[PDB]
Design an enzyme around this catalytic site. Sequence first.
Site, short mmCIF file in Angstrom:
data_model
loop_
_atom_site.label_atom_id
_atom_site.label_comp_id
_atom_site.label_asym_id
_atom_site.label_seq_id
_atom_site.Cartn_x
_atom_site.Cartn_y
_atom_site.Cartn_z
CD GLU A 11 -51.96 -23.93 -3.91
OE1 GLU A 11 -51.20 -23.25 -4.73
OE2 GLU A 11 -51.69 -24.06 -2.77
CG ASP A 20 -46.34 -17.74 -4.56
OD1 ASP A 20 -45.51 -16.71 -4.49
OD2 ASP A 20 -46.18 -18.82 -4.05
#
EC number: 3.2.1.17
Length: 162
Positions: A11, A20
């Site tokens: 991440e 995202d």
Amino acid sequence: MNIFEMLRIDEGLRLKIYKDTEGYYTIGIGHLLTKSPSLNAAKSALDKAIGRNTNGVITKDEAEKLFNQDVDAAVRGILRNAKLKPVYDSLDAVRRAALINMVFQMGETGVAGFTNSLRMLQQKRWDEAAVNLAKSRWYNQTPNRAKRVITTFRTGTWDAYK
């Protein structure tokens, strides 16, 4: 290599509200802020989370604090669930780690939802689960990640993370 490390990889870090792959306002090491298109909504979420006005930006340590939480939750969510616990307890340490992931990413709920795979895991059918795992919004929503984890499930090592 550990879970904290694993998720960092998966991440990474960002001290400013970003979207995202999917499109969700996130921040820190993978901390979903909100499914709303609203930045005002993520700005909102953020502050709240942090304890101050942030204008959308935080510290390495704030980021790293939230990360601690997220991870815990995730494991806490794993223990509080009749569907998942049995699995976990079945798993080797490395695999307990890929599973913590899955939960970190989608949540208690979404993963309790992979009925068959979770079965195939417990039965120890690594390959099978693998391909099962392979078709599911997931994998073809965040495929390099899926492929890491699916690999971690596979081989039961860190070769994909290494």
